[PDB]
Structure formats: structure tokens, C-alpha cells
Amino acid sequence: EQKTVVVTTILESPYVMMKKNHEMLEGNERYEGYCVDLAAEIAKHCGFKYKLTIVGDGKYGARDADTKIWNGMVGELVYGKADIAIAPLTITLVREEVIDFSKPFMSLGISIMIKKPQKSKPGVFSFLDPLAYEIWMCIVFAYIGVSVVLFLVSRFSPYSESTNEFGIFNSLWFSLGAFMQQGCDISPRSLSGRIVGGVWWFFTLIIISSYTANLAAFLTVERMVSPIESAEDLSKQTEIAYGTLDSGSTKEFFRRSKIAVFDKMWTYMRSAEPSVFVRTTAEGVARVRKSKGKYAYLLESTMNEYIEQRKPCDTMKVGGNLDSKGYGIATPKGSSLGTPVNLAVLKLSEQGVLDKLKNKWWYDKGECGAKDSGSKEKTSALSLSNVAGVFYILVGGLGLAMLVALIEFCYKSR
Amino acid sequence: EQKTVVVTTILESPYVMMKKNHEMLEGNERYEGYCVDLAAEIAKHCGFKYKLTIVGDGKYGARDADTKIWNGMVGELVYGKADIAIAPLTITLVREEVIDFSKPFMSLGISIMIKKPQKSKPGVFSFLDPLAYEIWMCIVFAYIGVSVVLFLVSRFSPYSESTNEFGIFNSLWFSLGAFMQQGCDISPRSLSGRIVGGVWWFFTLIIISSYTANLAAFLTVERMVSPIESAEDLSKQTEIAYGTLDSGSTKEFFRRSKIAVFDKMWTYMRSAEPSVFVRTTAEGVARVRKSKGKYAYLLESTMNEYIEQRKPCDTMKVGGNLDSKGYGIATPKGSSLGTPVNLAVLKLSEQGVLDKLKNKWWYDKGECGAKDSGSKEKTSALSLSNVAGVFYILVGGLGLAMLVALIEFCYKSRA
Amino acid sequence: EQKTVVVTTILESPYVMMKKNHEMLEGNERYEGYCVDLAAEIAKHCGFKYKLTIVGDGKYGARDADTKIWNGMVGELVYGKADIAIAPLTITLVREEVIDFSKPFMSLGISIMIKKPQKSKPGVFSFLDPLAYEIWMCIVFAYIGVSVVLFLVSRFSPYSESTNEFGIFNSLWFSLGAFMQQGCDISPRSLSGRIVGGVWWFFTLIIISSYTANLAAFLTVERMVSPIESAEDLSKQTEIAYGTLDSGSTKEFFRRSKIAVFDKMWTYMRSAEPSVFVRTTAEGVARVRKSKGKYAYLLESTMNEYIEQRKPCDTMKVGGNLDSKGYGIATPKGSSLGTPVNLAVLKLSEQGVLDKLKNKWWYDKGECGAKDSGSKEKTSALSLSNVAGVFYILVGGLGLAMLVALIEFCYKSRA
Ligand SMILES: N[C@@H](CCC(=O)O)C(=O)O
Ligand SMILES: N[C@@H](CCC(=O)O)C(=O)O
Ligand SMILES: N[C@@H](CCC(=O)O)C(=O)O
């Protein structure tokens, strides 16, 4: 007889979600999600009827220490309360000891989440940004060199001669006025001087006309600064607390690791108080959102890559994956379901249905501007905050000139 | 006597419109339009009298919800309530099952309608726009301050007061000419004057070069991306609602087609709430116009163009035809007229009378279409109307100086 | 006794490579590589003695042309030539039906390889490219001409020869200073001098603004589109030939998949002539390298990432993975040997030893680390090495003038 197989699963977005008409609809229609579509495909390929059920406590869990009492979904499968589990259940060595897994239908790794740092205004002195620091060094050394060669060449006192007005202070003024592309009231009037001037006018031309080119795109830059980038530094500084899900594979992974960085992270997490762990994923996400970015959460990238799809998008991934693991369908040991389930999983992976469902349940429901923001239209006008830095040095120079004038006055008239 | 031909049709513009004197006229003269002319032509060719009517409930009609009853005009034909339909009845595979269609008399496709995103209107003084108002405000207090400091510091006790030319007015001129980068005829010689000159030159640079830069930034291109043609973007976002006419070929097309983008659009339309459908094309256009651009209506492209080639010309067509279909005269599969109507439509198509008729009711009134095609060229030369605001300032400042000279002369005369 | 396990594998780099002393070594020590380390780990876990071999004909193998005979590794395995295969054997549905696979020990996807389109580097004097080469040669004769005509016309009989300062050398200075737009000491006062000044100013205005312009034009953006990834430029056109490895999972994937782009690629590959297939990955890479960029090869991305890390690193990977697959240890169906091997692979995966070995054999020998990926940031600041050619000219001209002053002084002394 067509026995309805007792499926067991857990509510988690977007794998299993309660449809909004659950107050009126009845049966399986109340449940939709990626795992519901996968279960439908599997049942259709195997050709049997099924009844959905939900785990009694919502825990993935493991065997309790020193009692060996299995619980959660694993307890449900070991003790035969259900026939097959279809859920994001990570393959691990301890679970393979008692339950069989199909070949993995999706691959994922550990990922890290923080509250995003909002973009910031450009700095005060962003007008000198388009050119590197060494260029602003060499421009000053070139200015000094031309200034002093032009003095040395004139006023050489041949076989008194004083026709050359180019004292050191007027040669120094001439070189500056020439560089700023402003006029001047004197010219070298001699061949070696004309030679020295003509090269500096070339240098000038080539330099200015290569700095005025890109200046709009530089006064405004939008995005800068981030708190961390490699996510390794969370092992080195205690300014930001972090933790993991309870009764999850991730906690066992960090307990079991022997890499010094992960063992240090575990040693911190295993003794810091108040409790850094959470009972559910969304509680963790809300804690991160509220804690001003002072708290960071570790979760499988299969979740982070969805959390960033949904508004308000105040949180973003960092760093690369620490490892790689797979999800799988699970069955009681020795049950006849295992081999046709494995063949069905293979055939669905070969047909590309899994990718179609991945697009259906990840990218069709994204709304934040990360989906498309490449238009990058021109910024309108040019706000004063972008240019305010130019006025401060002006007023400081006006304030310095008066001081120099007054000290020169009181020095001379004494 | 022979039986007078009972013709049937639906009130639709500009195919069939109420004559302005409908409250006073009598007989067939109450109706005029494209299809009334076409009916007159077919009548003159075939030679029979005819009496017009209007369909009872204003629906093109289709097969009902699997009850296999046909509503509207198709039902009026099949069940013998009328003898011939003359209307924009779209040829479809299900309708050929029960009625005969002539060869098509016009060609059309599915198309989209949305609100037009305005038209650009530069100001007279648009050249002031690449810098914000408060820069043009603060730079004047900057100029005043630099001038009055340079005066305060130049004409200060040399110990010989006659030594230096930088009086107030020459400082006020020098700092102006220095800001315009148009050269000068004097330069300060005191150190305290030279530092205030050099700082003003440094300001001058950054500023006049950031104006030229941003100025150029604009004159590159100014366009609005809009939804891309083929309207595939309607499948990528929920920001814009859309719907179709109730009981129409377009609704059956969306229900039936297995093209994944169209199937997704159907899945949206068949699940979105509240109801997006409308009973008439007029209501569809109104729901476009009033919805602040958040709604789009899907309709036959030969009806789209009429909404835009005639006043108020406020919408914008987007995209091309998604398919190809035709209209046809249709008759019960129980009558002999299926041959002379075909021969008539072919004869009229070959004599070009259809083109004369189309250019009587669509484009003969092409008021808005003057230069309406535009261009995508990014190399258009500047027109004089972009610059006139500088010529007015030049002429006004000439008139101002040519006035001030007279009063200075009269003062010099009477003093 | 624990009977010696007959292991089998295929020569492939870096999974299994010949030891440098293979002409002198004996026993198992002739072979080293990633899979030899993995085999040693499994042997240390389960303790059995093992003897390595190499597959007889160098093929991964598949079911024959409907004759239902298996060649290559899977053939040697099923018919009992060998007891366990340790190689990059892709898990596939047709293979599961006859042999058993452990859980996958590595992840990979299909990827595309082409020749990298070389590079260009700025010259020392790259600042002179933005205009021309013949313009820089034909502007010196312009300068000489304007100079010598201005001299010819200025110092012409005023009837008083001493009236005008524009001797040869002052004309030669004036026209230079005028060209640089850096002002001047004096201006001509004769009409015939003023017209030649006024024309030179116009030439300057129309030339120096087109240099600055084109100069800017470049510094906007610099990138080469290259062949579009995701098999677009492979499916759009026949311009680039491509073909899979013979007797491999990729050929079966392209045959079987009903994705229209992939089906079109298969239709091309199954009809292009002459034969595009190759027997080894080395031949595939050679046919990429030598074909002047007109050929592409389709291989596992874990192979691609190794070729992009071997001398001289001339290829480029394009696009992401087209799919997802894994590798597995495989054993004859129903044999007891595999049940502890699945647990061994899980244990080694959890202890992270697979990551250690991957680093040891892909990255702990990354001598080819050119790291020439760069960035797409169009806001990069100018580096000093883009400008040094102007500083060398400045210093050389300073040195030249500082030399000429001494010989002028010595002449003035001795004359
Ligand atoms: N997939 C995990 C969820 C919790 C975790 O990643 O630690 C499990 O079944 O345990
Ligand atoms: N020709 C269409 C008119 C309505 C529409 O689909 O736009 C029909 O018969 O249904
Ligand atoms: N892993 C592949 C190697 C050849 C290929 O990638 O085409 C196979 O077993 O067929």
C-alpha cells in the first residue's frame, strides 16, 4: 500500500516558510520553500505519497555528552519517528555513524557578518589627491633647483655691472609666478637665462595639463574605510565580541579544531560572558543589527548570501570561506529509500533543476541596490563641503601676512 | 425580399466612434469611423443593404470558464444573433475552430505603455549650474577680504608714504585681474604683499580649474535609461504593476504561452492583488496616467500609437512588438459570404484604399509628431539659446559704463 | 595475510607525476604526487600493503559506442583488473550505476581557457604620444617661419632704423613665449607685425587646446574587452575553434545537456572539421598556446588554476564555473573495502589534511606568482614613473645652460 512517508524538516528561510494564508489553507499548502520544491521533485521521481511534519523542538543538535541520548532531527531519524529528512543538514562524521546520507546537492562554507560601515565624505585636503606623494616632493625639489640655477647664471659680475634685476628673492618670485601660470613683469633678457626659462615653461605646461584632467571624479569618492577585511583580526583584538549558533555543527567544528587561531577563538567563546550564543539565526541577525556593529556572528554562507538580499541590507559578508561542507538527504540506516533517493539527487543535479530552484529562491526576491547599481550617473553641481578645505589655507595666509607685517613694522621703527 | 444584413461591432476608438450629433441623428448616420467606411466599401463591392448594431455587453469575448459557452461578439456570431462582424477581432487558433476569418487587413503586435518622463528645459543662466549657489556666494566675501587685506598691508608706514602704488582701487583691480587669469600690469614687492598674492593665486587655480572640469563633465550626455525594450525588465522587478484587458486575446496569450519570461509575467498577473484588469481600454489608459508611473498597461500596438499621435500626447511608447497577429472580417461557418469578403479585402488591399483610410484616422492629424523622432547623437553643436545669458550681461555692462562716464563728466564739469 | 591491494591511476599533473629519478629508482618510489600522499594516508589508516600501477591506455574511460563495453580506468576496475582506483575520477550518473563512490574529496567546475592578449607598458616619453609624430615635426618649421617673417617685416626701413626692438633674437623669444601661452614682454606696434602676431595667436589657441583635450581623452579608461566569457563568443560565432578532451566526462556532458547554448556548442563541436579533440590535457594546452589565440580548450577549473601557476603563465582563465561536480575514490560494487574508505575521507576532510596537501601542491610551489590581475578602479593616481621623462629634460636643460654660461664668460674675458 502507498504509505505516506513521514517527512521531517525545520522552519527556516528560504528553505521552509509558512505561507501567509496559513490561517485559511490546510495540508501541505501551508508550507512553501526550496526544500518543499525539492521534496516534491524527489517524491515525483520516486513515485510515492508523503506527509509533511515539523521537528518537535526546532533543533538540529547532536548526541548529548555522557548520556548518548540523540535529539533533534537526528533523534527523530534514529528512533524511527520519521522516514526521511529533507533539510539543510550538514554532513559530518558523527552523523554518518548512525544515519546514511545521499551525495551532496549543495556546497557551502563558514562565513562572517558585521554591521556595514556606511560610506563617508572625502577628506579636507582631497584637492591634492590626484597626484602621488613623491610627485609633490620632486616638484618642490625642482622648484628649488630652478630658483637657484637662475640666480647663479645671472649676476655673475664679469670683467660695476648691475643691470640684471634677478636677485635671489626676485628669481624665487619669478619661478613661482611662472608655475602658477600668472604673468610677470621681468624676463631673463640673456641667452642662458632664456634657456633656463624655456625649459621651466615646458615642465609647467606638461605638469598642470595632466593634473586638471581628472578633478571632478576625485573631489567626490563616496566609498572608503572598513573595520576589517581578512576577518583574521577577530582573533587578535577583543573590541568586537562574536559567537556561534548553539546545538549546531559550527560549534562542534570550533570545539574540535586544533588550528591555533580557531582554538584561541573557541577558548574565548567558551568562557566570555554574558552568553555570546543564540538559539535561532534571526535572533543572532537582530542582535548584530542592534549592537551597533560591536558584535559579529558566524553563519553558513548559504544564509549570508540571502540575508544581504533583503531590506534594510544593513549587514554584509566579509572574508573568504574557512572550509567546505555539503548538505544531504538523510535516511534511517539500511532503509530501502537510500539508493533511489541518491539516484534521484544525482539526476536532479545533472538536469540543472537545483540551479533553477536556486535562482527562484535567491535572486528573484532581491530588492536592495546591490542587484543593479551600475548606472553611476554624474553627480549634480559641486557642494561646498567638497571644496571647503581650500578656504581655510586662504584665511590662514591672510592671518599670517598681517603678523609678518606687524613684526616687520615694530622691528624697523625702533 | 432578401434578409437585410445584421452587422455587429464594438464601440472602440478610432475604429467606431459616436457621431457628435448622436442625440439628433437617426438611422445609420449616428456612427462614423474607420470600420464604418470599410463597411461602406464592402457594401458597395458586394451590393447589399445593411443595418448597424452595437454588441450587447462590450466584450470581444472568448470561451468561458470551461463551460464551453461563448460570450460577447463571438457568441453573437456563433449562436445566430448576427450575420457578420466588422471589428478589430484578432485571429487566434481557438476562434478558427468555430468561425471563418478572411485574409488579414492589418498587422500589429503586443506593446507596452507608460508615462512619458518629461522633457528637458535648460534655463537662461544654465552655465552657472556646475557650481552650487553657496560657492558663488562665499567667493565674493573671499574677493573682498583679499582686497582689503592687501590694501591694509601695502600702504603701511614704510619707515616715504608715496613709495607704493597699491591704493584701494588698484588692489581691487589687481585681485580681479588675478582671479580671471587674464594677466596684470603690476605686482607687489613687499614680502607681506607677496605672500598674500601667492595664496590668492593658489586659490584661483584650484577654483577656475574645477569649474572648467565639472562644466565639461555635464556636456557629455544627458539621458534617462528607461525600461529596456521587449519589457523583460517587467519580469525582474515588482516596482511596476501591470495588467491586461478582461476577456481579450492578450490575456489568453499570457495564460497559454510557455515562454518562461511570459509565463513568469502571467504567474505575477494571475497572483497579484488587488485585481489589475480593466473592462475598457479607456480605463487602462486612465490607470496608467493616474498611477504616478507605477503602472503599465499591455495593449495592441495599433491602439497604442493612437494614444500618442493625438492630443494630449502625454504618454510614451516603450519597446517593440512581442509577436505578430492580424485582424479579420469574420462570419458564421454557415454562410456563402466567405468568398466575396475575401475577394473584396484583397481587392481593397491591392488598390491601396486601406492605406488611404489609415492615413485618414491615425496620421492625418499628426500634430505632435513634428521633429518628435529626435536623435541619439552625442556630438550636437551648441545652439545660441544656450549662451544668450552671457550676451545680455555683456550688453548691460556696456550700457552701465556708458552711463557712468556721463555723470563723471558732468561732475568734473560742475565741481 | 593482508593480500596486496592492486591500486590503479593515470599520469596527470600534479595528481601523479614521474619522479626525477625514475630511471634509477625501484618499487613504489618512482611515483610522487598529491594522490600518492593521499594513498599513503589511507594506507596508514587501514594498514594494508599496496602496489601502484598505471592504467594501460591513459583514459578515464566511458561506455563505448552502444556496444556496452567500458574502456579505460572504469573498464580495468569493473572487470577485476584492479581493486581500487585513486584518481580525479568525476562522479557521474552513468558511473554510479556500476561502481560505488565515496563522498567527494574536492570540488570543481567546468571552465574555459584562452591565450592572454599580451600587455603594453608606457614608454619613458609616453607624454608625447597623445598628439602625433608628424605634427611635432611640422610645428618646428612653423615656428622658424613665423620667427623669420616677423624679423624680416619689423626691421624694415622706417622711412630711424633704431625705432623698433624686434631684432632676430627678440623675435625668436617672442614667438616662443607666445606659443607657451605664458605672456610676453612686448608686442609689435606696426600693422604688418600685428597681423603676423594675430595669426600666430590663433594657431596657438587651436593647437594647445586639442593637445590638452586628447591628452585627457586617454586617461579616462584603458581596458581590452577580450573574448566574452560564459561561452558567449564561442556560441555566437565560429571565429574561435574549441573542442573537449576525448573520452571524458565533459564530452558526455556536452552531448547530453539540453541547455540551448550548450546544445549549440555541442552541435558545433560534433560537426566542425578537422578533429578538434585531443588525447591529453598537455596536447589541449599546446593547441591553445600555439594557435595564435584562435583556439580554446574546455577543462576542469582545478586544472586551469594550475596552468595559470606554471611557467611562463601566459594563459588566462575566463568566466566562472559552468556547473558543480566532485571527485571520489571508487571500488568494485559490493566489495567490503570501501565502507572504511568513506569514513577515512571524512576524517581527513575534518582534520584539514586535504587543505594542507592542496596548499603543499598548488601554493607552496607558486613560483609563477606574477599576480598581474590588477584592478578596475578608474581613479588611480599618477605614479612618478609616468612623469620622469620630464624631469630628465628639466635637469638636462639646466645643465646645458649652466655650461653655456662658462664659455660665454671665457669668450667675454678673452675677446
Ligand atoms: N547545518 C548545520 C546548522 C548549524 C551549524 O551550521 O552549526 C547543522 O545541521 O548542524
Ligand atoms: N484584439 C483584441 C483586443 C483587446 C486586446 O487584447 O488588447 C481582442 O480581440 O481581444
Ligand atoms: N575529470 C574528467 C577529466 C577530463 C575532462 O575534464 O574532460 C573525467 O574524468 O572525464
* Ligand with smallest separation from the Cα of B251: 2
Taking the CA of residue C215 as centre, how many other CA atoms within 13 Å lie in the half-sphere pointing to its CB? 20
Q: Which residue of C has its CA nearest to A347?
A: C93
Q: Is B90 a known ligand-binding residue?
A: yes
* Residue from the list A129, A138, A191 with its beta carbon closest to the beta carbon of C384: A138
**Cα(B300) to centroid of ligand 2, in Å?**
7
The answer to whether A280 and A92 have CB atoms below 8 angstroms apart is no
What's the CA angle centered on C57, arms C53 and C59, to 5 degrees? 100
* CA C249 to ligand 3: nearest atom: 10
CB pairs under 8 A between A and C: 143
Ligand minimally distant from the alpha carbon of residue C246: 3
DSSP string, B48-78: --EE----SS-----B-SSS--B-HHHHHHH
C104 Cβ partners below 8 Å, 6+ apart?
A103, A104, A326, C91, C326, C327, C328
**DSSP for B101-115?**
E-S-S-EE-EEEEEE
How far from B111 is each of B114, B290, B296, B302, B319, CA to CA, in Å?
10, 19, 10, 9, 7
Which residues numbered 162-181 in A keep a CB inside 8 Å of some CB on B? 173, 176-177, 180-181
Partners of residue A405 in chain B, C-beta under 8 Å: 153, 156, 192
Determine the distance in angstroms separating the CA of A303 from the nearest CA of chain C, rounded to an integer: 19
Is the CB–ligand 1 distance for residue A7 below 6 Å?
no
* Relative orientation angle of helices C168-179 and C191-220, to the nearest 10 degrees: 40
The reported resolution of this PDB entry, expressed in Å, is: 3.6
Contact partners, residue B93, CB within 8 Å, separation at least 6 = none
Contact list, A122 vs chain C (CB under 8 Å): none
d(CA B109, CA B35): 20
Residue A60 Cα to ligand 1 midpoint, Å, equals 7
* Residues in contact with C266: Cβ distance below 8 Å, sequence separation at least 6, in sequence order: C254, C255, C257
Residue C242 C-alpha cell reads as: 574549441
For the CA of C299, the closest atom of ligand 3 is 6
Select the residue from C168, C398, C409, C411 to test the A interface by mutation, using most A Cβ atoms within 10 A: C398
Atom in ligand 2 nearest the alpha carbon of residue B247: 10
Which amino acid is it at C30?
A: R
Tell if the CB–CB gap between A130 and C219 is shorter than 8 Å.
no
Give the chain B residue whose CA is nearest to the CA of A404. B192
C212:A209 CB<8 A: yes
Of A319, A313, A314, nearest to A299 by C-alpha is A319
- The residues near A404 (Cβ < 8 Å, ≥ 6 apart) are B191, B192, B195
Chain C contact for A104 (CB, 8 A cutoff): yes
Distance of CA C306 to the CA centre of its chain: 13
Short-list A144, A56, A49, A44, CA closest to A347: A44
Q: Which residue ranges form the domains of chain C, and what is each CATH number?
A: 5-106+327-363 (3.40.190.10), 112-121+227-318 (3.40.190.10), 139-219 (1.10.287.70)
Q: What is the residue type of A124? A: V
Of the bound ligands, which one is closest to the alpha carbon of residue C108? 3
Backbone φ, ψ for residue A241 (5° rounding): -85, 155
How would you classify residue B72: left for phi > 0, otherwise alpha for psi between -120 and 50, otherwise beta? left
Nearest to C381 among A103, A132, A347 (CB): A132
Smallest CA-to-CA distance from B169 within B186, B152, B151 is with: B151
For the CA of B327, the closest atom of ligand 2 is 1
Contact check, Cβ <8 Å, C180/A202: yes
What is chain A's length? 414
Give the CA angle between residues A89, A93, A96 to the nearest 5°. 65
- Shortest CB distance from A378 goes to which of B135, B183, B218? B218
- Which residues, 6 or more positions from A161, have their beta carbon under 8 angstroms from its beta carbon? none
A183 and chain B in contact, CB less than 8 A? yes
**C-alpha–C-alpha distance, residues C250 and C246, integer Å:** 9
Of residues B152, B193, B205, nearest to A180 (C-beta): B205
Query: Alpha-carbon distance A348 to A44, whole Å?
Result: 12
Q: Which helix (H) or strand (E) holds B253?
A: helix B249-256
For chain C positions 207-246, those within 8 Å of chain A (CB to CB) are 211-212, 215-216, 219
Other beta carbons less than 10 A from residue A103's beta carbon: 22
**CB-count exposure of residue B324 (10 Å: 0-12, 13-18, 19+):** exposed
Q: Is A250 in the pocket of ligand 1 (CB under 6 A)?
A: yes
Residue whose CA is at the smallest distance from ligand 2 atom 5: B248
Q: State how far the alpha carbon of B124 is from the alpha carbons of A267, B384, B388, B389, B392, in Å.
A: 70, 11, 7, 5, 10
Q: Which residue has the cell 581557457?
A: C113
What are the residues facing C330 on neighbouring strands?
C85, C101
Pocket probe mutation, ligand 2, options B10, B244, B245, max atoms within 8 Å of Cβ: B245
* Burial classification of residue A130, based on how many CB atoms lie within 10 Å of its CB (0-12 exposed, 13-18 middle, 19 or more buried): buried
How close, in Å, is residue A297 to chain B by CA atoms? 31
Residues of A whose CB is below 8 A from B206 = 127, 387, 390
Continuous segment of H or E residues that includes residue A135: helix A133-153
Asked if residues C99 and C333 have their Cβ atoms less than 8 Å apart, the reply is yes
In single-letter form, the type of residue at position A85 comes to A
Between positions 136 and 165 of A, the ones with CB within 8 A of B are none
Residue having the nearest C-alpha atom to atom 3 of ligand 3: C248
Amino acid letter at B162? S
Beta-carbon contacts of B43 under 8 Å, excluding residues fewer than 6 positions away, are B49, B50
What span, in angstroms and rounded, lies between the C-alpha atoms of C153 and C173? 16
Is B67 marked as binding a ligand?
Answer: no
Residue C323 C-alpha cell reads as 556547473
How would DSSP label each residue in C14-72? TTBEE-TTTTT--GGGGEESHHHHHHHHHHHHH---EE----TT-----B-SSS--B-H
A117 CB within 8 Å of a chain C CB: no
Query: Count of H helices and E strands in chain C?
Result: 15, 13
**Cα–Cα distance measured from residue B171 to residue B151, given in angstroms and rounded to the nearest whole number:** 6
Q: How far is B213 from chain A (nearest CA, A)?
A: 6
- Contact status, residue B78 vs residue B32, Cβ threshold 8 Å: no
Tell me how far apart the alpha carbons of residues A180 and C193 are, in angstroms, rounded to a whole number: 30
CB contact under 8 A, B200 and A394: yes
Take residue C336 and report the three cell numbers written for it.
Answer: 567490503
CB contact B132 to A (< 8 Å) = yes
Choice from B10, B15, B60 to test ligand 2 binding pocket (greatest atom count within 8 A of CB): B60
3-state helix, strand, coil in chain B (%, to 5): 45, 10, 40
Is there a contact between A340 and A112 (Cβ–Cβ < 8 Å)? no
- All residues of chain B having their beta carbon less than 8 Å from the beta carbon of residue A387 are 135, 206-207, 210
DSSP A266-283: HHHHTT-SS---BSSHHH
- Atom 1 in ligand 3: which residue has the minimum CA distance? C90
Atom of ligand 3 nearest to the CA of C281: 4
Distance CA C74, CA C56 (A): 12
What are the two backbone dihedrals, phi and then psi, of residue C278, each rounded to the nearest 5 degrees? -135, 155
Contact (Cβ atoms closer than 8 angstroms) between residue A333 and residue A98: yes
Which SS3 state, helix, strand or coil, does residue A102 take?
A: coil
